[PDB]
Amino acid sequence: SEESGLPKLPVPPLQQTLATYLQCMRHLVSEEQFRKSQAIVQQFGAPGGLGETLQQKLLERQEKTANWVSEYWLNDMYLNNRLALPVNSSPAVIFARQHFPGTDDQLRFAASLISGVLSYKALLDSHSIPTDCAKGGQPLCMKQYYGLFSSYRLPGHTQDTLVAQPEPEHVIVACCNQFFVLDVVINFRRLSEGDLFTQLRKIVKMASNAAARLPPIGLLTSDGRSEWAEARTVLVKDSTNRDSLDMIERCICLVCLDAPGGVELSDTHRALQLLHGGGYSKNGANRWYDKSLQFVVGRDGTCGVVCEHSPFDGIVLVQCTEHLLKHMTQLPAPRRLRWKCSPEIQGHLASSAEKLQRIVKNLDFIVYKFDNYGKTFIKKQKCSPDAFIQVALQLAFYRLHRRLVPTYESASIRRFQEGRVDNIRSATPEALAFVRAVTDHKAAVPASEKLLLLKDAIRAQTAYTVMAITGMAIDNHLLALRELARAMCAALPEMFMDETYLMSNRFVLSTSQVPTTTEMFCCYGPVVPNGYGACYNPQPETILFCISSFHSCAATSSSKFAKAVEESLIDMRDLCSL
């Protein structure tokens, strides 16, 4: 009645997780390091040993909590991360290209979008969104929907805070780096699209007035999390700033009326604008990255949403955005938020502009549309499209870099209460056997044998996927054992100080499938300096890859990786056509 009917997240058996862990890492560490890790794990999991003690504590935690990993996972994946949110953390979703002859066309789109946000939020708030079922079925957790609009991520010196929340409700409109409170309710009557248009015109006019222009405070939210915690602490010394921060913290979402980009509106360029606004000289300060959703409606027709994803993952977000876009197809003045700055704040602003520009220049990003085939061909090979593509990315990484690396693939655990994600470790032993056969010409493995190895790697990938989505994989389980150990003693046991364990969690290849039904697509940066981010959207006859890496790292190249992906998909096609 008041409590969820969903199952709780399972706790895997301890020995199952330790065995899977060792077999995951054997081929990714040296033989000497692996021998040491084998003995460490044996001691940790011995009868009556520490692992068994921690496992008992984890089963007590499962009984006392709705989800035993929620707190640890939120802190480990997001709130402890000190990197600036743009590129490093906040994914971008790019909508179909739009065409706005005049400003009023841009404003009519933004008015229509805001109206759809208000309608969707009314469905949400009255619990009218139909329960998702697995594979589009077993019911899925719906809690992430309540985090789409009611969430604000506060910076902290060492750990951030995720705050959940209002009479009336308002959005914040960002224009020319200025922020305006737009109430979306007058006399308890929701503003119509026409009223919203009229209000947005008032905002664009006020934002263009240089005598009222205020400093670009939003730039500070683009900095490292400890840097922005420090600058925000300066701001909150003044009551005007506290009032303005409070208005942003409690808004529904941001709507960002970006200026024209001046670059060709390719898919790659539109994505760059959604990821980091092009830096301070372009739209990079027209942002507030702590707020969960920042819809961008650019003057030139670049539209999308920038997502702070501590409160929700991408499947729920795409459900929301597709509903918004599909249903677009079917009076007091807004208040400028004022700011009281100091010489301190000017220094923080200049430093944030410089730090953001390093991120802009460092990001190597490419949108690559593979057009030779898609899901239809892959399914004719008795393969899951996701597993086939994951194996292709392993072959791409191996043929370019001549090793496999610890790889992350998001797996939804929404089958369980409060469920977010666990990790599918796609760098399997079977994937290694396959990529070596394909690339080692002197070994002269027959194509017929490469095909057997291909299908066994796809089998192993599919098996790991089922394991992860049913709560039986290893990353969340080890995370909880680690953090329960830390509560006993700040000195972690050797199990988690082991270089094999640290190595295992540096995801040089970080991936996810985010399928969409419209022309929209999702992207994000890498999670380690020598890594890639790879987000793909498989369609019946094509596959879209968004590949990121950092220009600082001489080993990686997004262009070269996309070419290796193409060659791998062609190789796999030829093997399946024997």
Ligand X SMILES: CCCS[C@@H](CC1C=CN(C)C=C1)c1cccc2ccccc12
393: partner contacted, choices ligand X, Na ion, none (Cβ within 5-8 A by kind): none
Q: Annotation-wise, does 376 bind a ligand?
A: yes
- Here the tokens at position 496 are 């988690």
Which listed range, 206-214, 393-401, 527-535, 569-577, lies at the site for ligand X (CB under 6 A)? 527-535
Q: Contact between 366 and ligand X (CB under 6 A)?
A: no
Q: Contact between 74 and Na ion (CB under 5 A)?
A: no
Those residues with Cβ within 8 angstroms of residue 218's Cβ, 6 or more apart along the chain or in another chain:
174, 177, 179, 285, 286, 287, 288, 289
Cα–Cα distance between 27 and 432 in angstroms, integer?
A: 8
Q: Annotation-wise, does 446 bind a ligand?
A: no
Q: Contact between 315 and ligand X (CB under 6 A)?
A: yes
Q: Contact between 177 and Na ion (CB under 5 A)?
A: no
Contact pick of 500, 537, 556, 568 for Na ion (by CB under 5 A): 556
Which listed range, 17-25, 249-257, 446-454, 510-518, lies at the site for ligand X (CB under 6 A)? 510-518
Which residue's CB is nearer to ligand X, number 90 or number 557?
90
Contact pick of 54, 522, 564, 565 for ligand X (by CB under 6 A): 522
* HSE of 56, CA atoms in CB hemisphere, 13 A: 7
Q: Contact between 509 and ligand X (CB under 6 A)?
A: no
Q: Contact between 85 and ligand X (CB under 6 A)?
A: no
Q: Annotation-wise, does 406 bind a ligand?
A: no
Q: Contact between 533 and ligand X (CB under 6 A)?
A: yes
- Here the tokens at position 85 are 């949110």
- The dihedrals phi and psi of 251, each to the nearest 5 degrees, come to -80, 165
Q: Contact between 463 and Na ion (CB under 5 A)?
A: no
Q: Contact between 108 and ligand X (CB under 6 A)?
A: no
Q: Contact between 218 and ligand X (CB under 6 A)?
A: no
Cα–Cα distance between 128 and 146 in angstroms, integer?
A: 12
Which residue's CB is nearer to ligand X, number 106 or number 423?
423
Which residue's CB is nearer to Na ion, number 492 or number 553?
553
Which residue's CB is nearer to ligand X, number 486 or number 506?
506
Kind of pairing, strands 532-538 and 543-550? antiparallel
Angle made by CA atoms 95, 202, 100, in degrees to the nearest 5: 35
Contact pick of 314, 385, 406, 538 for ligand X (by CB under 6 A): 314
Contact pick of 307, 359, 366, 544 for ligand X (by CB under 6 A): 307
Which listed range, 101-109, 308-316, 360-368, 564-572, lies at the site for ligand X (CB under 6 A)? 308-316
Q: Contact between 558 and Na ion (CB under 5 A)?
A: no
Cα–Cα distance between 235 and 308 in angstroms, integer?
A: 22
Element (H, E) at 452: helix 447-469
Q: Annotation-wise, does 109 bind a ligand?
A: no
Is residue 485 classed as helix, strand or coil in its secondary structure?
Answer: helix
- The dihedrals phi and psi of 281, each to the nearest 5 degrees, come to -65, -10
**Least Å distance between CB 209 and ligand X?**
35
Which listed range, 178-186, 187-195, 304-312, 490-498, lies at the site for ligand X (CB under 6 A)? 304-312
Cα–Cα distance between 410 and 313 in angstroms, integer?
A: 9
Cα–Cα distance between 284 and 87 in angstroms, integer?
A: 12
Q: How many residues does the chain have?
A: 578
Cα–Cα distance between 256 and 218 in angstroms, integer?
A: 11
- Here the tokens at position 207 are 């934002």
535: partner contacted, choices Na ion, ligand X, none (Cβ within 5-8 A by kind): ligand X
**Least Å distance between CB 386 and ligand X?**
11
Which residue's CB is nearer to ligand X, number 389 or number 485?
389
Residue 76's nearest CA partner among 536, 477, 467 is 477
Site for Na ion in 512-551 (CB under 5 A): 549
**Least Å distance between CB 354 and ligand X?**
25
Helix 447-469 / helix 429-439 crossing angle, nearest 10 deg: 150
Cα–Cα distance between 191 and 331 in angstroms, integer?
A: 10
Q: Annotation-wise, does 223 bind a ligand?
A: no
Q: Annotation-wise, does 377 bind a ligand?
A: yes
406: partner contacted, choices ligand X, Na ion, none (Cβ within 5-8 A by kind): none
Range 566-570 contact pairs with CB under 8 angstroms and sequence separation of 24 or more: 566/368, 566/370, 567/396, 567/399, 568/392, 568/393, 568/395, 568/396, 568/399, 569/370, 569/372, 569/373, 569/392, 569/543, 570/372
Among this protein's residues, is 276 annotated catalytic?
no
Which residue's CB is nearer to ligand X, number 106 or number 294?
294
Cα–Cα distance between 282 and 296 in angstroms, integer?
A: 13
Q: Contact between 512 and ligand X (CB under 6 A)?
A: yes
Q: Contact between 421 and ligand X (CB under 6 A)?
A: yes
Q: Contact between 321 and ligand X (CB under 6 A)?
A: no
| Active site residue ranges | 309
Applying CB under 6 A, the residues found at the interface with ligand X are: 91, 93, 307, 309, 312-315, 317, 410, 412, 421, 510, 512, 514, 522, 524, 527, 533, 535
Summarize as ranges the residues that interact with Na ion (CB under 5 A): 549, 553, 556
